[PDB]
Amino acid sequence: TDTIVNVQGSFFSASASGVADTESLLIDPQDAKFGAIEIHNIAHGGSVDVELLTSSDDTELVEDAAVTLDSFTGEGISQGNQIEASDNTNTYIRITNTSGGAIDIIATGREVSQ
Amino acid sequence: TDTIVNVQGSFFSASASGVADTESLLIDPQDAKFGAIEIHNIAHGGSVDVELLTSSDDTELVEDAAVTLDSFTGEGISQGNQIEASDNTNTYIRITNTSGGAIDIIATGREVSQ
Amino acid sequence: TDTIVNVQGSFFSASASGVADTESLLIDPQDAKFGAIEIHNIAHGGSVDVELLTSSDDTELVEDAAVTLDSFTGEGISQGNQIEASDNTNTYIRITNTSGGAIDIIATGREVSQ
Amino acid sequence: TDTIVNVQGSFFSASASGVADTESLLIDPQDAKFGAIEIHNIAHGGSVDVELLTSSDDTELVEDAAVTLDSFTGEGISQGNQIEASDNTNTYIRITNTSGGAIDIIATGREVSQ
Amino acid sequence: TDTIVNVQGSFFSASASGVADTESLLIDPQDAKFGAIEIHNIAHGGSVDVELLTSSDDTELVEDAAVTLDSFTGEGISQGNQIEASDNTNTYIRITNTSGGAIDIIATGREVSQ
Amino acid sequence: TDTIVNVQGSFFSASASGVADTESLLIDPQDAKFGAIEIHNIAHGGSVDVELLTSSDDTELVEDAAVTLDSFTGEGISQGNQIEASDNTNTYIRITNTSGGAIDIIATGREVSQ
Amino acid sequence: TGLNPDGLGRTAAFSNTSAESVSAVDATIDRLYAQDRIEIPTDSRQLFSTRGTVLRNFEDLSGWTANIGSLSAETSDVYVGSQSARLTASSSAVDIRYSFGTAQDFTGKGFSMALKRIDVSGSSDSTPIKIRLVDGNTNYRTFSARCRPGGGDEWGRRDFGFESEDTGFDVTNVQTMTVTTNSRSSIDILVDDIRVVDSSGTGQVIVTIDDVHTGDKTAAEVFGRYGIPIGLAANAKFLDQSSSKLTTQEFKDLLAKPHVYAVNHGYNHYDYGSYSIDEIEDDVIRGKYELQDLGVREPNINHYVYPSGNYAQESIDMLSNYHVMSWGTGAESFDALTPNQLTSPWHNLRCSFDSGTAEAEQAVNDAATYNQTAHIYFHSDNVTQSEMESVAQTINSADVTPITLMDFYNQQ
Amino acid sequence: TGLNPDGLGRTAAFSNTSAESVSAVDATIDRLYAQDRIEIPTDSRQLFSTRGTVLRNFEDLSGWTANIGSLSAETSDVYVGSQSARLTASSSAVDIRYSFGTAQDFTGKGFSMALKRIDVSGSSDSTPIKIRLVDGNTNYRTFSARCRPGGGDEWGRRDFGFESEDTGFDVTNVQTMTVTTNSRSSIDILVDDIRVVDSSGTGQVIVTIDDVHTGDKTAAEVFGRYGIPIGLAANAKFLDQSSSKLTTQEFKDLLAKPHVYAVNHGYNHYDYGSYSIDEIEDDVIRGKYELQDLGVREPNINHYVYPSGNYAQESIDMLSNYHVMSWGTGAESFDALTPNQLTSPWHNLRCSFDSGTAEAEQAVNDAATYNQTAHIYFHSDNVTQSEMESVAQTINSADVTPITLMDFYNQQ
Amino acid sequence: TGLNPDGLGRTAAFSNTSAESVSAVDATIDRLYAQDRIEIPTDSRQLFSTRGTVLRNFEDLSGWTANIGSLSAETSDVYVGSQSARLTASSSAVDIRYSFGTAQDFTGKGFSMALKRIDVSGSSDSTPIKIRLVDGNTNYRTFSARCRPGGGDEWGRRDFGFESEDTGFDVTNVQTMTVTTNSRSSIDILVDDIRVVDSSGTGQVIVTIDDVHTGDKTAAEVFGRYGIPIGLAANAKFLDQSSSKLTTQEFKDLLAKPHVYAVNHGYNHYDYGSYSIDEIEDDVIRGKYELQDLGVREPNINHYVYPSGNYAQESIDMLSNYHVMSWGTGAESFDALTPNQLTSPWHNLRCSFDSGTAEAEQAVNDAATYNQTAHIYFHSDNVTQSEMESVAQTINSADVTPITLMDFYNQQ
Ligand SMILES: [Mg+2]
Ligand SMILES: [Mg+2]
Ligand SMILES: [Mg+2]
Ligand SMILES: [Mg+2]
Ligand SMILES: [Mg+2]
Ligand SMILES: [Mg+2]
Ligand SMILES: [Mg+2]
Ligand SMILES: [Mg+2]
Ligand SMILES: [Mg+2]
Ligand SMILES: [Mg+2]
Ligand SMILES: [Mg+2]
Ligand SMILES: [Mg+2]
Ligand SMILES: [Mg+2]
Ligand SMILES: [Mg+2]
Ligand SMILES: [Mg+2]
Ligand SMILES: [Mg+2]
Ligand SMILES: [Mg+2]
Ligand SMILES: [Mg+2]
Ligand SMILES: [Mg+2]
Ligand SMILES: [Mg+2]
Ligand SMILES: [Mg+2]
Ligand SMILES: [Zn+2]
Ligand SMILES: [Zn+2]
Ligand SMILES: [Zn+2]
């Protein structure tokens, strides 16, 4: 039988340094080559709210559905997520600072096919 | 040996903003390209009942078997599901609002082959 | 290197509405295209016993080995299973009603190669 | 990019009805097409000891290394295993009855390449 | 249908013996053939802080975003991680000794496609 | 779309019968066809220390970094590991007897691509 | 993290896990953050049953005279020993009498008896059962308890409250004791094991308020004027339902007062006989955790009060997993009253002052005089402020210590 | 292993799991291996508040005469009832007097009062507050407690230690009682709810040693000579820090002695006001688990001693999740002293003999004479062996039972 | 579900999990369903060691006269203080005497002493050790305990049972105290810390039955005839083994009786010295959980009884993680007997009536007379019904309260 070596699909990340008190990292699957993402890690330099949004617009965020998924307190990593978003389903992930001061946010995961 | 990069299979989502008190998001695998789905995430803007239904009809929901899978209270994400539905087996997932007010529901997952 | 999109293998389900008090859904891997199945979900409309059986006959169930795997009480979903059965190894999964009344049973999973 | 549907690799099972008090099911990876196995499930109709053995002989079990992995009490399923054996590494899995009476044993899993 | 044997994608490791008290192993995804990594294991010969950094520079670490992910105490293994880094997104993982003495650090995982 | 059956990548094992009191099984990824390994199972016939080592030499073990990963007491199986080693990164896994008497050690897992 | 634990099946080494529900056969926890217990380790059902000494044994019925009704040995349905006594009557009371060989001194002794109701019918399906002590001059002191359906369906101990005394009764010169009932068309009740306990301590009062009505605020002020502890028998569902009920903040503010404490009354007041044991168990469990979220902690939340006073051994068995003690309802002075040492923490009643303060005030005066514990209760919608003041002044002026249920159970 | 549990979300059936941290809403455990509790089910804050009976009520201030200072009703900031009393003075003490309608007998009675400090200023931001009993011959017996910032910031009960007595005082013939302070430029303090408790039992002594100095070894020998229990208020971080502190092995060796026990003092001695409540909580939690690893167990490790004696209701609220009882610091005999029945396990002080043994020895003699509990303390670096011996001989020769903190709390 | 918890390593957010075994460092549980504890938070080993007051400290041996044998200071192997006493004899008893400076009154005082056996040899490797009070007329009152291997291998406290009295002994006029042994070829025993406890309360009796023989059914009837509580020292493996043992249903039926309770005796009766500490620990743990499945709950299942009476400090240390109290075996009246206040919950014996009722009946009469607690025991296969009746009638007619082990430990 044929042997093939499987290397895992395209790495995805979004990051922002010095996100101000109530500002946010908008993770947009439009930035993915495949147009969909699965975020595995959220490294949070301080407290954040994670929010999943559907847009009315194909290309810009105009809030339709919005659900606040979870709140993270202090500094650390939310490892082992599968929060998913795509361009065609107009889904965005917003990570909003709640720390009372400037923080670094790094979100990593994988690109998924639409 | 051959090396191949594996990107993960087609993203699927269903969403509804402002689902009224006793209304529901009907997740229909007919909307999938492959005609079957596996829902991983249910982001629930308030309390919901999740229900798995078989239809008597190939194309429309006429309830045959129905099982209420679980109840979610308040706002959050049911991560790590594998609730599965296909068109050919006429399986539907209904997420019904129970909050006493209007909510946003976002369900995400993956398309599966029939 | 080559990029390929991996969509997941064939959806499988078995279902029965209004299974009477001591009757059962017989999940038969003969109904799978690949002739083997892995059940992930059992949605149980009431109490059930799950049972794994080997047949003496290649095509019909004549009980050889039988093990009662687990008992589920009330309504819900047994998510995240890997109960496995194949035609060639003559393995059947029986989900038997124990509710004291008629129930809906939906089992979902994936076809596996023999 | 190319889309491929991935069906999961060859189902494997070993079973025995009415295994007497101190007798055993010998799971032999020589029975696999690929000559190696990964057992995921042990359905045990009563108490069993699971044992991993290396043979001195390429084709028959003549005990070299033997480790008793675990003891299961009563009836049920050991789901979610990855006990592994191959023909070329002469590895066998023995499931030994300890119930004080005759039991049914069904072990299921997947064939793995050597 | 076609049968293929899937061998898992490229092994990645970074290691350092005798890392002094406040020194660090810089895990750089530039050292990966595919230019991205997912660290699964951190074997820590003593206490360490794990830190995820974005660089301003494409090729050298000049700290932009930095998040201290977690602190490990004493000797052991952090198994089951998915901390991810890529060259193109200029992401580095720093494992910093905090033991009060010299330690061995071994990080293992897998290369991922960008 | 194309359907392919995925059989899982090459089985790997290392074993030793009658390992004396302070002796060890050296698991060497040089013995793998692909030159890297991921150990999933350690079946331990008595107490063992597991240790991850980097060599200074490409082909022989001359200890550079060494971390004692974990200690196992008595007889059993450490199932569900992902301890990883490769030839090119000169990584070895040593399982050292600590029982006070002779034991059987069987380690199983999978070959991984470098 | 470490490597995976020893064993077959799904094994996993984790750093941090979160779960809604965890089931374990065994859990080894190095440091436990679990102040909020639902299921309590203590089984109180039979702890107190053997306290004090057996006075009347019923192993020989020769010492007993049936004055009215009839007395026979029960050898098949026995509480304690080789036999128990069947008390039987048709269209009459039962009165059985034991004459002591020598004068007994029962100063500061409290009385308790094992009881099972087989059948009572007529004017009521229930009777007062009375232990009387009679002196050399034929003066009676009466202590009593209730033989009711539900609570009497299985063998259980009653701890007898003082009821009445003839003037000039000499408790140092007791010549005979009597077990007696009211008159009924049919009586069939089993008795065994009369016990004597030391109750020489000061008299005590417990006050409980049921069902979380808005009037609990005025009650807290009134009983506060004399530092009398109030137990709120709390149903957490009732909070914020209507203007007639406390708000959640008002309830938390009341519990912040040094003399107000909460005890469980079930989330939604599910009483025995109206709901299944499973539904009541859920109500009990939910009541417990909801009150724990409101800050009600261990010694307090180990007490329950029966919704509508309804119970049986079935409910006691279920409740014993969650609570150490529970209280029923009655309307007469002796219903409040127990010796200071209980023999059942499950079968004892409380006296209502919803329908007039006289019996409850009588009970408080009797607790002081006869060295007993009076448990009195009300719903604050049924009682006026001037009635609460009458009761609170009665408690202040009497020789009683007002106490919490926690104090009372810790004394046992 | 079985099949996966009922539910949506990630459900999982496991054999054996290992975790660093587990969070669960519900945990059902068939067999629990969790002897090391951090978070205790018992909330002790208000259990003892209603012990004994209310003597002085303050619901009618007509019975009180302001001898010096001034007295007014507080109807908004009330501990108990409809009102409390505001005691107010400018450049003077406050002395308020209640004459009893009939002579009172206070033999073996202990006094407690509810207190809140609004403002004290002048020589100090604190005052002794004194309950005096005065007899027919105008002899005084004084009991006292401290009205301090922090501990007085919110309503809390003080249990009054004996201070002084006039020769020939007749406790059977008390005609009047006084509440009084020292003189200050400004006084504004609220009082309510004077309570009487039974303290007729033998006198008791508790000895604690703070801060784990090397001199605890000589202390253990000296107090050992007379079998007097020592509580080590232990900070686990301090072990092995320096030659001036116990080693870990020395500490374990001390705890192995039948009369030496440990109580929590926080891992790194974080005191109230110097650190946030969150940092102190972490210190408390870590102190608890580190001492548990050293073998300190349940009844012992349920006690805390405030670092530097600093506390407030904020800290008590936090500590009440982890501990049942805590102790502050004072330098005078009455600071050691409480009735044998407490009404607060949180607000009571200990007397130092770091700066001379006189006050502590006085307290021990007074505990014997007046049937009270004396809590005395020291740092073993401040006290010479001859001083420890003086104190230990004083305890041995006095009519006191030397007791553990565990014993003392189990008595409440 | 939420998102995965903070941290590196394998982290997971679950809804519902099932496990056989969970290991956690920290567990935060919002609502705990874990009534069945294996590990208990309470370490009882040293709680009671300092109760009462030290009478003799042995810190100055000048006050002691060696009448027979020899007395020296032990300054390195010390229980309490600077020194302990070495009692040494060759081919003789040791008798050491302390004359009091003034006549002592020991009415209702119970005696306890610290003991370590270095060497005893001759007729036995053990001795009775006697504390012996002498009045002005040279009448003796003897209290005694046993200096045995195992239980005497390390320092431990014995609580001395009444043994004998000379006619006309005046306990108000005690002039001399004596510590004495039986005669042996070699004696080397260390003593320290004689303690006096208040034991003025009523006499008490505890009855235990070992090893779950079928005769426990007739015992339950017989002791039931007087409401005397029985503890079954239960080995859960023995149930259903043979016709000579209780069935599981019979055992559950016995425990459903108000006067029968169970205590742990290890799953399969593994005794100290016959098995390793690890095997005994497994036996103890399995005994606990199997009895918990049979419905034996917390206060009851916190008691253990040593298999075959075998123990040492090693086994006590292990058992203290699981149980609060344990009992050994003896054959003489004083073996039953302790003061009502213990100083060790681990070193006390029980008196057998397997080989005749005389010593046990003597103990019950002595418990009544001298205000002590008698623990008596039997195996129901060794005892005839008329012997059980003799003992039960003796307990009924004596001035004792028959009590549970739970009651007895809650009194300490
Ligand atoms: Mg779009
Ligand atoms: Mg919205
Ligand atoms: Mg589109
Ligand atoms: Mg269809
Ligand atoms: Mg239906
Ligand atoms: Mg079709
Ligand atoms: Mg077939
Ligand atoms: Mg069969
Ligand atoms: Mg075939
Ligand atoms: Mg072979
Ligand atoms: Mg071997
Ligand atoms: Mg070969
Ligand atoms: Mg770059
Ligand atoms: Mg930064
Ligand atoms: Mg670039
Ligand atoms: Mg190499
Ligand atoms: Mg090294
Ligand atoms: Mg190379
Ligand atoms: Mg009877
Ligand atoms: Mg007031
Ligand atoms: Mg000494
Ligand atoms: Zn109610
Ligand atoms: Zn300090
Ligand atoms: Zn035995």
Residue numbers in the entry:
A (entry chain TE), B (entry chain TF), C (entry chain TG), D (entry chain TH), E (entry chain TD), F (entry chain TI): 2 to 115
G (entry chain TB), H (entry chain TC), I (entry chain TA): 2 to 413
From the primary publication:
Here, we present the near-atomic resolution structure of Haloferax tailed virus 1 (HFTV1), an archaeal virus thriving in extreme salinity. Through single-particle analysis, we obtained near-atomic resolution maps of DNA-filled and empty virions, enabling us to assemble full atomic models of the virus pre- and post-DNA release, including all structural protein components. The full atomic structure revealed that the virus has a length of 1350 Å and an icosahedral head with a diameter of ~600 Å. The tail has a length of 560 Å and terminates into a baseplate with three radiating TFs of ~190 Å in length.
Threefold rotational (C3) averaging focused on a single turret position produced a 2.36-Å-resolution map (flowchart S1). Turrets were found to consist of two separate proteins; a base formed of a hexamer of gp30 [turret base protein (TBP); Fig. 4], and a trimeric turret head protein (THP) gp31. The THP trimer then inserts into the TBP hexamer with a longer, 12-stranded triangular barrel, elevating the THP above the TBP. Six histidine modifications (likely phosphohistidines) are found at the hexamer-trimer interface. While all these modified histidines belong to the TBP, three directly interact with the N termini of the THP trimer via salt bridges, contributing to the stability of the interaction between the THP and TBP. Alongside three Mg2+ ions, the THP trimer includes three catalytic Zn2+ coordination sites. Analyzing the structure of the THP using DALI and National Center for Biotechnology Information (NCBI) Basic Local Alignment Search Tool (BLAST) indicated a similarity between THP and polysaccharide deacetylases from multiple species. InterProScan reports that the deacetylase-like domain encompasses residues 199 to 413, ending at the C terminus of the THP. However, a second conserved domain is also reported, corresponding to a galactose-binding domain-like superfamily (G3DSA:2.60.120.260), which spans residues 57 to 198 and makes up the second externally facing subunit of the THP.
